């Protein structure tokens, strides 16, 4: 054993997925006013399987002739949650090397 | 959820009740007693009721 795949766990992939998720939410907020755009959601378990997709969000309310299915209340909350979890993933993956370096150097 | 309902203003019809009659004593003044129309043709030529 003793390999980076096992030392880092899955925290090496989660940081990437949280970046992709943040990009999609940023797209949804920007495309909220453009008619005909369908809100895109990212399935977390899919990138989990890709580590070891880009779906559509069904609206809770009807459109108003635009056909745009973006709820700005939902997007802000989902962007806040993703950003908080992204920082935790950096903390988890960052400490993997800090412990790894301390084991090797002994100091 | 069925929460958004638009409303549009439209003309459902017209009021066809008899108008106010003005007695003028002029020979060439005519008013329709009760319901009825006068058929006339406009500038283009298409006939219509007045």
From TrEMBL, chain A:
Q: Name residues in a coiled coil.
A: none
Set out the biological process GO terms recorded for this chain's protein. bacterial-type flagellum-dependent cell motility
Q: Where in the cell is it found?
A: Bacterial flagellum basal body
Keyword Nucleus listed? The answer is no
Transmembrane recorded as keyword: no
GO cellular component labels: bacterial-type flagellum basal body, rod
Q: Which terms are listed as keywords in the entry?
A: Bacterial flagellum, Cell projection, Cilium, Flagellum
Q: How does it assemble?
A: The basal body constitutes a major portion of the flagellar organelle and consists of a number of rings mounted on a central rod.
NCBIfam families found in the cross-reference section: FlgB
Q: What does this protein do?
A: Structural component of flagellum, the bacterial motility apparatus. Part of the rod structure of flagellar basal body.
Protein known as: Flagellar basal body rod protein FlgB
Organism, scientific name = Vibrio alginolyticus
Starting at the broadest rank, the lineage of the source organism is: Bacteria, Pseudomonadati, Pseudomonadota, Gammaproteobacteria, Vibrionales
From TrEMBL, chain B:
Complex and partners: The basal body constitutes a major portion of the flagellar organelle and consists of five rings (E,L,P,S, and M) mounted on a central rod. The rod consists of about 26 subunits of FlgG in the distal portion, and FlgB, FlgC and FlgF are thought to build up the proximal portion of the rod with about 6 subunits each.
Q: Which family does it belong to?
A: Belongs to the flagella basal body rod proteins family.
- Whether Protease counts among this entry's keywords is no
A GO cellular component entry from the record: bacterial-type flagellum basal body, rod
Record keywords: Bacterial flagellum, Cell projection, Cilium, Flagellum
Keyword rRNA processing attributed: no
Protein's name in the database: Flagellar basal-body rod protein FlgF
Starting at the broadest rank, the lineage of the source organism is:
Bacteria, Pseudomonadati, Pseudomonadota, Gammaproteobacteria, Vibrionales
Q: Give from-to of the shown chain within the full protein.
A: 51 to 100 of 249
Source organism superkingdom: Bacteria
């Amino acid at each position: 054993a003793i390999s980076f795949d096992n030392a880092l766990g899955i925290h090496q992939h989660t940081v990437g997925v949280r970046e992709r998720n943040a990009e999609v939410i940023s797209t949804n907020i920007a495309q909220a006013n453009t008619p005909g755009y369908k809100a895109r959601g990212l399935d977390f378990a899919k990138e989990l399987q890709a580590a070891t997709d880009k779906l559509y969000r069904l609206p809770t309310q009807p459109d108003t002739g635009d056909g745009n299915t973006v709820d700005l209340d939902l997007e802000r909350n989902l962007f806040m949650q993703n950003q908080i979890r992204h920082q935790a993933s950096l903390d988890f993956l960052g400490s993997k090397f800090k412990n790894l370096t301390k084991a090797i150097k002994g100091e | 959820h069925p929460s958004r309902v638009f409303s549009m203003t439209e003309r459902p019809g017209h009021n066809f009740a008899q108008g106010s009659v003005i007695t003028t004593g002029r020979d060439l003044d005519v008013t329709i007693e009760g319901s009825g129309w006068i058929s006339v043709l406009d500038h283009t030529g298409k006939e219509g009721l007045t």
